[PDB]
Write a protein that binds this DNA or RNA. Sequence first.
RNA 1: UGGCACCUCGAUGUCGGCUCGUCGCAUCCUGGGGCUGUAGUCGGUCCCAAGGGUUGGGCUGUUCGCCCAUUAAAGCGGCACGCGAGCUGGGUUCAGAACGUCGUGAGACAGUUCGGUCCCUAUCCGUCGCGGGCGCAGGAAAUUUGAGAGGAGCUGUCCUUAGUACGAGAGGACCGGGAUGGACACACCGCUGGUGUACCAGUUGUUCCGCCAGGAGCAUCGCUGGGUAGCUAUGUGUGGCAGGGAUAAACGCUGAAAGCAUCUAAGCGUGAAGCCCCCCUCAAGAUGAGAUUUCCCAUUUCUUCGGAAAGUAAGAUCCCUGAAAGAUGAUCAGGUAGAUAGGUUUGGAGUGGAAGUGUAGCGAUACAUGGAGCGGACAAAUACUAAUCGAUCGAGGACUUAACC
Lengths: 122, 122, 53, 113, 206
Amino acid sequence: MIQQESRMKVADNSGAREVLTIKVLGGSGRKTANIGDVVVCTVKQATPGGVVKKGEVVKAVIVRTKSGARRQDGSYIKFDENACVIIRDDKSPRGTRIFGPVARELRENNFMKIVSLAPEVL
Amino acid sequence: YRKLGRTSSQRKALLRDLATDLIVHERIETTEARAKEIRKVVEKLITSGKKGDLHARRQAAAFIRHEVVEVVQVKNRPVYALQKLFDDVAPRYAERQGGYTRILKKGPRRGDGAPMVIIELV
Amino acid sequence: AVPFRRTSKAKKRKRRTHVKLQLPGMNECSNCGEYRLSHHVCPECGQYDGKDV
Amino acid sequence: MNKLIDEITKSQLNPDVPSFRPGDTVRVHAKVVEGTRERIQLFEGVVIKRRGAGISETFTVRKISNGVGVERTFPVHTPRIAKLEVIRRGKVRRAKLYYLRNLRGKAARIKEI
Amino acid sequence: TKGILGRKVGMTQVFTENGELIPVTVIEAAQNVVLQKKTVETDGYEAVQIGFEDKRAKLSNKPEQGHVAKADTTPKRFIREFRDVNLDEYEIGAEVKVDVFAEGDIIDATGVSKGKGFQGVIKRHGQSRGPMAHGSRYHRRPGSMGPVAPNRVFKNKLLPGRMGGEQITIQNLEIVKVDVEKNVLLVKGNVPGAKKALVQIKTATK
RNA sequence: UGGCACCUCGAUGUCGGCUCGUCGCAUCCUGGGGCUGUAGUCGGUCCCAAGGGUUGGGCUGUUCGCCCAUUAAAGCGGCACGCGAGCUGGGUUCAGAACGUCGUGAGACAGUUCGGUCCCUAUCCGUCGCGGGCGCAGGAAAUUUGAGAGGAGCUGUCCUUAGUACGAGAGGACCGGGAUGGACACACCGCUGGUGUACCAGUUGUUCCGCCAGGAGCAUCGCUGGGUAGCUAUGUGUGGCAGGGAUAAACGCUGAAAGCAUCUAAGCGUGAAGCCCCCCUCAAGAUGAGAUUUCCCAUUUCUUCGGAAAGUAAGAUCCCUGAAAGAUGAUCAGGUAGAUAGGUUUGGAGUGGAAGUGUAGCGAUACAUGGAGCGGACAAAUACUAAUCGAUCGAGGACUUAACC
Ligand SMILES: [Mg+2]
Ligand SMILES: [Mg+2]
Ligand SMILES: [Mg+2]
Ligand SMILES: [Mg+2]
Ligand SMILES: [Mg+2]
Ligand SMILES: [Mg+2]
Ligand SMILES: [Mg+2]
Ligand SMILES: [Mg+2]
Ligand SMILES: [Mg+2]
Ligand SMILES: [Mg+2]
Ligand SMILES: [Mg+2]
Ligand SMILES: [Mg+2]
Ligand SMILES: [Mg+2]
Ligand SMILES: [Mg+2]
Ligand SMILES: [Mg+2]
Ligand SMILES: [Mg+2]
Ligand SMILES: [Mg+2]
Ligand SMILES: [Mg+2]
Ligand SMILES: [Mg+2]
Ligand SMILES: [Mg+2]
Ligand SMILES: [Mg+2]
Ligand SMILES: [Mg+2]
Ligand SMILES: [Mg+2]
Ligand SMILES: [Mg+2]
Ligand SMILES: [Mg+2]
Ligand SMILES: [Mg+2]
Ligand SMILES: [Mg+2]
Ligand SMILES: [Mg+2]
Ligand SMILES: [Mg+2]
Ligand SMILES: [Mg+2]
Ligand SMILES: [Mg+2]
Ligand SMILES: [Mg+2]
Ligand SMILES: [Mg+2]
Ligand SMILES: [Mg+2]
Ligand SMILES: [Mg+2]
Ligand SMILES: [Mg+2]
Ligand SMILES: [Mg+2]
Ligand SMILES: [Mg+2]
Ligand SMILES: [Mg+2]
Ligand SMILES: [Mg+2]
Ligand SMILES: [Mg+2]
Ligand SMILES: [Mg+2]
Ligand SMILES: [Mg+2]
Ligand SMILES: [Zn+2]
């Protein structure tokens, strides 16, 4: 459950460190995004010398949340922090490495490159 | 259960008092709901006395008030409510399963029209 | 929050048509022959259910 | 209760599951289904909680992978668990171990019995 | 078109052969019999009258005891009618079994909701609160009652009152498993009413 | 924006926001069409159409406006600029103080700036729920028809048809089929969570149970970690599916007036998210008081007939035990023809390893007896306790005509 003003850590190799969410895409009155949902956001903190600079408007995909997803078989998954990966116009990441575990739900949304780069798809 | 016009600590103290006068006097006059509530507690207490352990005695002593029933020429030492409950009242109902008390309705009180009853253990 | 017009006698009595009180639920004690409330101990001979209380 | 539900659901209880209690380390062989492939991956961690009764009982396993803690909840009698086995027998004093969500190594260690 | 009457026993879940886990509600439908048959030459419409549970002769009276004796059975506790049904079947006094349905049929559930008492306008109608800080003195109140010009308040101005307890039907609701010997019926999802309520199950209209 | 000065000065509260809506159509989106300087995709303009829908923020007291990010779309207006005995009080519009400016001055300024008391127990109508009475030509118990009324009505993206029709290319369809969502609505607590002040455990200070051990009172439930029933959303299931009849704009067939032509004059056919149905709920006080099945029957006194009272039948209630119901009435489950509530015996969730004794250690403590002990509301058995005994209400069915009679 991530809405506007929510602030989540970014988990890839681009220059960003922390991100604040501007808008949840996918409807008119939509008020919440979860794992596998693209969100428009802005960069509040960046590493020096990175590709992505501070105060830049980008879109990104949610990759793990503290309130995860439930599966058809009746099983759940929950992480410890809200993480994010900055993507391009299509579904290809703007970094080259991805840190931490990644939820399986990204595969069914056709985020294949991110799943390929992730160190663990739980 | 029912709240009797008083908070949880005051209600518990009311129920410990009333359950003790029924043990000592075997017959008391109170109101309707106030009697329908001590009906349960007195019988749970008598069941504890029926078991007759040391664990049961301690568990009952955590509820009985500490007051003298009568002094006997045993050296003339007094007896307490717990002694009477475990030595006199409980052996009476050895061959009886439940229902150690009955309630008999009397009529309204002059001061406030409260419906009074009489509850007495036989 | 204050009456616009005073209330007439007819309206007052019409409102008070339901402000009566019912009749006690009593019958006659078998032992006494006197009146008592049902499911109660009679105050005259002090008995209930054919036994002395 | 309501013994009729027990009669209806008695045929689907899994009798193969071993006996475990919160605090000890288990290894779960879970059947994960890819696009068209059937596969088993392992999930190893300490069991954090165990709630419910009957066919509607669940348990939760916690693991730290790549620096991020993960929790995974399963029904006890699910048929998508190929096998469950117990490795260690931790010693704890609780029934729900939620205090482990705020502890990192050398303080999230469970003794052994 | 089919139909039976039953009691809501409880609420549970089962595992399908595919592997997924679904919630189900259990309904017990024992002892229901066909009482009377209504025809268009005698009544103006076609229907069947079903009675559900046997009850003690102490609780039944002479009128209804004669009505049930006309079909050679004992007095029933619940009696209802089903329309849009074929009158060729349903001999008078014959019993209806849960096996009239099969695993996979789509049904309709009809029952009386759980009762909520005198409830306010935010629980009853889903209104919005007013601010609860910044000096406001308006928290859980109904709202404006309307404009000034009519000199009155319109109808359907939603206000507090008794909340629950109406008839509700929820539809297109699949069935999961039928157990003939135990007279139960496992049907997927929720149905209105508290436990021990009466549930009227019948083939989906659409 | 004004003109007038007709009601109100023995008081008709003012801007913006909040809560709650309802109406118009000069239609922002979605639906159906005509013309195009309409190749396709996208458009322009007009016609029919009010069923549903019509975003979250930065600045300003702001309405307005600009900007950011979305969306199928971010419509224009009325209702005392809708709504202060529904809320706020930032602005304006009270007493204090200061600036610029005007005045000799006291002071003033649709100039600015900081601070500044928002009262009321609902009588009548109105609205939302719930009861009592009588009526419905005998008295009762159930099941129902439906005049009439309310609710719902929204919409995206992806795949296929198809890289087909079209187009030099670039690009890229109509019509039809499938899958899955956003917002909204109803129900429910099996799952994920919330709460859970008579459930379980740890712990601080101090007083008490004569002392140790074990417990109790008070300190926000003293604090802390869990949590049953019940109530719940952020959780789960389901819905707006597919259609029928008559039409609006429009498109036609046959056809004269007016040897031709013409959709109209007589006569036929297509045609919308709109109308009436379909779907959900209420509904016979629908005084037009309806229908079906079943039960009780034709007593006794008086009456000038009309009619009255006075015991009953079927049935219902008083009173009592209660919850799946509930402000109180009402509804529902029961009253010894008994499992209605409490207890008792077995369980269950929940907590987590009781007291007593023993062993190891100088000791705090640890281990065993032992998944132990406790266990509100959950389940099944069991008349042990209380639903004892009684009392009250409740029909003998008017007249006329019409068919076997
Ligand atoms: Mg206290
Ligand atoms: Mg457990
Ligand atoms: Mg709000
Ligand atoms: Mg307040
Ligand atoms: Mg008027
Ligand atoms: Mg004017
Ligand atoms: Mg003049
Ligand atoms: Mg004036
Ligand atoms: Mg005046
Ligand atoms: Mg128009
Ligand atoms: Mg249009
Ligand atoms: Mg159009
Ligand atoms: Mg509208
Ligand atoms: Mg700011
Ligand atoms: Mg408007
Ligand atoms: Mg006004
Ligand atoms: Mg106004
Ligand atoms: Mg205002
Ligand atoms: Mg007003
Ligand atoms: Mg002010
Ligand atoms: Mg001044
Ligand atoms: Mg000067
Ligand atoms: Mg001040
Ligand atoms: Mg201030
Ligand atoms: Mg000011
Ligand atoms: Mg008021
Ligand atoms: Mg009435
Ligand atoms: Mg109608
Ligand atoms: Mg009417
Ligand atoms: Mg509507
Ligand atoms: Mg729940
Ligand atoms: Mg729960
Ligand atoms: Mg001590
Ligand atoms: Mg003290
Ligand atoms: Mg607590
Ligand atoms: Mg047609
Ligand atoms: Mg249509
Ligand atoms: Mg009738
Ligand atoms: Mg109960
Ligand atoms: Mg009764
Ligand atoms: Mg019982
Ligand atoms: Mg029996
Ligand atoms: Mg246990
Ligand atoms: Zn007497």
